[PDB]
Design a protein around this ligand. Structure first.
Ligand SMILES: *[C@@H]1O[C@H](CO)[C@@H](O[C@@H]2O[C@H](CO)[C@@H](O)[C@H](O)[C@H]2NC(C)=O)[C@H](O)[C@H]1NC(C)=O
Ligand SMILES: *[C@@H]1O[C@H](CO)[C@@H](O[C@@H]2O[C@H](CO)[C@@H](O)[C@H](O)[C@H]2NC(C)=O)[C@H](O)[C@H]1NC(C)=O
Ligand SMILES: [Cu+2]
Ligand SMILES: [Cu+2]
Ligand SMILES: [Cu+2]
Ligand SMILES: [Cu+2]
Ligand code: NA
Length: 499
C-alpha cells in the first residue's frame, strides 16, 4: 500500500539481502526501497519522521529530502543537512509539513545526510493529478506500475573512501537483483501486465551513482513525463537514465503473452546479463512461470536523446535567445583533483550552522555566509542562466538544483542551444569533455537551494554550492515551526558541538 499524504515514517536499522548477500541497512518503513509516499497535486503532506537508528556505522542521525518538490515558503522542510536543517537525532521525530501546489508527477525521497541514502533510505514519492492531461493515454497507474532502479553495495557507505571511484555490487530493480561477483540465483522482480492494457510506468532512478541503459525486450516506451514535467509523447526503445531522474512512459502490453527481460545496464560495475544480473521480468497474465528467453538487440535504433523531448505545455524559455541572455548569467568552474571536487575553486564542506539558520539570524549577504565561497546569492524575480561545462573526472555528472526545475537550454553531446522548446527537468547530465550544458530558471522562491552533482560520492567529496535565492525575503517567506528551531540545539547538545 501507498502511505500519505499524512503519515508517520520510521527510520530503522535492519538486515536485508536483496541480492542474496546479507548486510545491515538504513530503512524507511522497514523495506528497500521504502514505501511509496503519495497524494494529489496541491495536497498538504505531513510526514512525521521518527529517527529510530542505533547503528553508528551508518550514522544514527538523519534528515530526509523530498526530491523535486519546490518547498515554496517551506525551505526549512527541504531536508539537506546543514543547508536547511540540522539532522534529527536518534529517539526524536520531526514533522515535515509542506504543500505541493502546482506540481504533479513522479518524485522520490532520500536521506540527505552524508552518503546515508546509499545505505538504504530511498523510496518513491508520487503526486497524482486528478485532471491529468495524459490520463487518456493509459489504463493503469498505481503502486504496481512504479519501477525503481538502484545501485547496491556490500561495503557500508561510511567505509567508502572519499573522492574514490566507488563501484556497486548489484543492480536492483524494484528492490531485487543479482550480485555481479559470486552471483547466486536469488529472486528477480516481476512486473505483471494484462495483454491489451496500457500502463503508466513510473521509472525512478534512486541511484547513488551509476546511470542505467533501461529497456524492455520486445517492447517500446512512450515518454509522457520527465522529472515531474509533462512531455509530448516520445517513443523510444531505450532510456539512459541518470541518478535521481524520473520518466513516465506508456507501456502497451501488445506483444504475445509471455515473459520478457527488463534490462538496466549500469555504466560501472557488472556489464551484461550473465546469470541474470542487471535484470527483472515482465510477465503477462497467463504466461508460464519461467524466466524469459528473449534477446536484446545489438544496438538500439530509437534511444532517448534529451533534445527530442519537449514540454506538453507551452513553457518556452525565460530570457533572451543567446548565451548570457539573462539577468544573472553564470558560468561555473567545475573541477576535480586529489580526491576532492570544487565549484568556482571551493570544495563544499558542510557548515556547523545550517545556511538557512545563518540567514534567519541576520547574515544577509553571501560573503557573510558559511562556508565561505560556497554560497552564491541570487537576486529576486530575475532570469538566471547557469552554464555547467563538463570535463571534471568521474563523469557524466547529473547536476540537480533544489527548489526549482529548469529549462535545459543545451544538453549533453550537442553544441546547439535551444531557446524555443527544450524540456524542463530537475536533474541533468552535464555530458563530456567540451560540452556546455546550460540551464535557466526564474527566481520566485526565496531560500537557500542546494546545487550539486547527484552522484552521492561526489557530493560527499565536495561537488556542491548553495544558491542563496533572495536572501532579503528568506525570513518573511519561510516562517519556521518551533520543532525546526529545536533541531540545532538538540543536535549540537547530543554531539557536544558549540555554536
Ligand atoms: C559556456 O557558455 C558560457 C556562456 O553561457 C561561456 O562563457 C563565456 O566564457 C568566455 C571565456 O571563456 C567569457 O569571455 C564570457 O564572458 C562568458 N559568457 C558569455 C560569452 O556569454 C563559456 O566559455 C562556455 N564554455 C564552454 C566550455 O564552451
Ligand atoms: C541538437 O540540438 C538541437 C537543439 O535542441 C536540435 O535542433 C533542433 O532540431 C529540431 C528537430 O529537427 C528542429 O525542429 C529545431 O528547429 C532544431 N533547433 C535548433 C535550435 O537548431 C538537434 O536536432 C540536436 N541534434 C541531434 C543530432 O539530435
Ligand atoms: Cu535527490
Ligand atoms: Cu533535490
Ligand atoms: Cu559527479
Ligand atoms: Cu541535494
Ligand atoms: Na522566451
Amino acid at each position: 500500500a501507498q502511505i500519505g499524504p499524512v503519515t508517520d515514517l520510521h527510520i530503522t536499522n535492519a538486515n536485508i539481502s536483496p541480492d542474496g548477500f546479507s548486510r545491515p541497512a538504513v530503512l524507511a518503513g522497514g523495506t528497500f526501497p521504502g514505501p511509496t509516499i503519495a497524494g494529489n497535486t496541491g495536497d498538504n503532506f505531513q510526514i512525521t519522521v521518527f529517527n529510530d537508528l542505533t547503528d553508528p556505522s551508518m550514522l544514527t542521525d538523519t534528515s530526509i529530502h523530498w526530491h523535486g518538490l519546490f518547498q515554496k515558503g517551506t525551505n526549512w522542510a527541504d531536508g539537506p543537512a546543514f543547508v536547511t536543517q540540522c539532522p534529527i537525532i536518534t529517539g526524536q521525530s520531526f514533522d515535515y509539513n509542506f504543500n505541493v501546489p502546482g506540481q504533479a508527477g513522479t518524485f522520490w525521497y532520500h536521506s540527505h545526510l552524508s552518503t546515508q541514502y546509499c545505505d538504504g533510505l530511498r523510496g518513491p514519492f508520487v503526486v497524482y493529478d486528478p485532471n491529468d492531461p495524459n490520463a487518456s493515454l493509459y489504463d493503469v497507474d498505481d503502486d504496481t506500475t512504479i519501477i525503481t532502479l538502484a545501485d547496491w553495495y556490500h561495503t557500508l557507505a561510511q567505509q567508502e573512501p572519499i573522492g574514490a571511484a566507488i563501484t556497486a555490487d548489484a543492480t536492483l530493480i524494484n528492490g531485487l537483483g543479482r550480485s555481479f561477483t559470486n552471483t547466486t540465483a536469488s529472486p528477480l522482480s516481476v512486473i505483471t501486465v494484462q495483454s491489451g492494457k496500457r500502463y503508466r510506468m513510473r521509472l525512478v532512478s534512486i541511484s547513488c551513482d551509476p546511470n542505467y541503459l533501461f529497456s524492455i525486450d520486445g517492447h517500446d516506451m512512450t515518454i509522457i513525463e520527465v522529472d515531474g514535467v509533462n512531455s509530448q509523447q516520445l517513443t523510444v526503445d531505450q532510456i539512459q537514465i541518470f541518478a535521481a531522474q524520473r520518466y513516465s512512459f506508456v507501456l502497451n502490453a501488445n506483444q504475445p503473452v509471455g515473459n520478457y527481460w527488463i534490462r538496466a545496464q549500469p555504466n560501472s560495475g557488472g556489464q551484461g546479463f550473465d546469470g541474470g544480473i542487471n535484470s527483472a521480468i515482465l510477465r503477462y497474465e497467463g504466461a508460464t512461470v519461467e524466466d524469459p528467453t528473449t534477446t536484446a538487440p545489438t544496438t538500439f535504433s530509437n534511444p532517448l536523446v534529451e533534445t527530442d523531448l519537449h514540454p506538453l505545455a507551452d513553457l518556452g524559455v525565460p530570457g533572451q535567445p543567446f548565451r548570457g541572455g539573462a539577468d544573472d548569467p553564470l558560468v561555473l568552474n567545475l573541477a576535480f583533483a586529489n580526491g576532492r571536487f570544487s565549484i568556482d575553486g571551493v570544495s563544499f564542506v558542510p557548515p556547523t550552522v545550517p545556511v538557512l539558520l545563518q540567514i534567519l539570524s541576520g547574515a544577509q549577504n553571501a560573503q557573510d555566509l558559511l562556508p565561505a565561497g560556497s554560497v552564491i546569492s541570487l537576486p529576486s524575480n530575475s532570469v538566471i542562466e547557469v552554464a555547467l561545462p563538463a570535463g571534471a573526472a568521474g563523469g557524466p555528472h547529473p547536476f540537480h538544483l533544489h527548489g526549482h526545475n529548469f529549462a535545459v537550454v543545451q544538453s549533453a553531446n550537442n553544441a546547439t542551444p535551444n531557446y524555443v522548446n527544450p524540456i524542463w527537468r530537475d536533474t541533468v547530465s552535464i555530458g563530456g569533455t567540451g560540452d556546455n550544458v546550460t540551464i535557466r530558471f526564474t527566481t520566485n522562491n526565496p531560500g537557500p537551494w542546494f546545487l550539486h552533482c547527484h552522484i552521492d560520492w561526489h557530493l560527499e567529496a565536495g561537488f556542491a554550492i548553495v544558491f542563496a535565492e533572495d536572501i532579503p525575503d528568506t525570513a518573511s517567506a519561510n516562517p519556521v515551526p518551533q520543532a525546526w528551531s529545536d533541531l540545532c540545539p538538540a543536535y549540537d547538545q547530543a554531539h557536544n558541538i558549540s555554536t
